[PDB]
Symmetry: D2
Subunit: 171 residues, 4 copies
């Protein structure tokens, strides 16, 4: 036999251990349209109908975005857009209200509630109206049979909607 001394410079005393990390995917959509009717005299929404081009998703990552279009997510070939249609606005006060509407994702429809929070009602520089409001609320993937193949473990059953809107009077 024979004795050796490590060469610390070309020796690695190494280990690998697997762990999980929870993180939020944040995303918007670049391309959508809305029809907004609002009465600044009473701080009530009268009609709110949004259509979102699924195609235009942006989670700040190209490969995931493309993946979102596929059969196991949006199926944008078949169902190119998601729609929201307001059915009812219940004023709480001038800053706050409960908004009820029909959300349609990949052809499945469910009535959801969003929390309307009016961040500002104004008359502009030019004497024409402005508003700034937010719509917030949790929807469940399962309620829309959305991404059924993906486990509620890997990806949460809960999506959190945060629609932040600035908007000016028409014509």
């Amino acid at each position: 036999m024979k004795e050796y001394t490590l060469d610390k410079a070309h020796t690695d005393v190494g280990f690998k251990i697997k762990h999980l990390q929870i993180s939020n995917v944040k995303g918007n959509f670049k391309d959508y349209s809305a029809v907004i009717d609002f009465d600044p005299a009473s701080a009530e929404f009268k009609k709110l109908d949004v259509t979102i081009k699924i195609a235009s998703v942006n989670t700040e990552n190209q490969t995931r975005d493309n993946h979102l279009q596929q059969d196991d997510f949006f199926k944008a070939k078949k169902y190119p857009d998601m729609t929201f249609t307001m059915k009812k606005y219940e004023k709480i006060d001038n800053e706050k209200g409960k908004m009820t509407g029909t959300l349609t994702i990949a052809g499945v429809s469910k009535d959801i509630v969003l929390d309307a929070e009016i961040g500002g009602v104004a008359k502009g520089k030019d004497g024409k109206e402005k508003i700034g409001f937010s719509l917030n609320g949790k929807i469940k993937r399962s309620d829309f049979k959305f991404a059924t193949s993906t486990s509620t473990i890997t990806l949460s059953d809960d999506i959190n909607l945060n629609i932040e809107v600035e908007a000016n009077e028409k014509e």
Copy 2:
């Protein structure tokens, strides 16, 4: 009432969804010592005893490294080093053998098997010996009651040892 048109430039149609991601933590130790007895005539290890300074862990991230020293991981104040002591080497052939030894982590001891893979036996430039070998094997956190507070979900019960050694003859 009154009609508005979104200002696309100050409107975000946004969502947040939580997901899990699996990843490997890879780490070595900067500071360790070893005693290596090997017989290049028969490709057998005769004695292999390593001591690793827990303090010197490096997972390429400072905040985790410091955290590894704490009570819920290594407890480096109380147990500053981990030790491996070979008990038995069973040659398979000149490239391969089963190494049995006692691993001690934070004062708990268990007999583990590593797979010896001899990457090269040589005589150096100067006519003095060299060897290059690896030791590989899976150990279970649970077997060493290590990081008991951390769930086997978050952090895997399995640690994978990959000890890569270059070493030269002594004196």
Copy 3:
């Protein structure tokens, strides 16, 4: 050499694979008290203050219940009760309202909103009042620095409150 034939009766061609499963822990509390002021003329809550004896938790499992009392959950020795104090009731209509109050868990306090849903307002057999309502809402463990040691992976950051109340007039 020699040839053999399996004894199918004492042969197991076996495998073990680890998987995760998501499930809800459901629980109530056996022991709590409440003070309830309500105006059946206007369907408004006037005062609603609840105190819950942490000790009396019941998740239909004894070992978990005991565990819930410990330092890494409720710390029932130090903080024996959780309290809810209503601060504001905003009527939506006679069936629905937004309730705002202060929740206190292990000495940490946060203002939460619950969704009041009045399931029934009545005059009893005896001509004395009754009500049946529910309070629902999501609270975040993190907002109350509750069970900080447990990862948001293993146990969800979201707790869902479902307070189902039947109640009769006093004196």
Copy 4:
């Protein structure tokens, strides 16, 4: 307004929280065949070829078993059987050896090592041979592109093989 007292008997102060639980799926196969050549003089395997009817899986649960046959697992319509073919047996001693072979799952093939552990070599009541051995080892789903759709989070990349064999001499 008016004051009420809870009816503790029809009041639930309730909560629901989601958590993950890790567990092992254990399974065998009811229907398989093997060809076993072994030399009790030298405790060496000479030939070991197994074929397993995927159809006959049993994880003590019918709905999962059926599911295992489907496209996202075994695809038993296309690939009805899994095969193991020994390529090399390296004796360690009479109780232990390293077995190398080709595992084929759903038409994908990889060379794996199992740890042979000979639990007993005998001559029977009738003077004809017996053996009892085990084969153990970890295989990676990813190495066989098996259940590619299922995340390594939900279901572990590691399957642990435990083949427990009793067997008697032929003819």
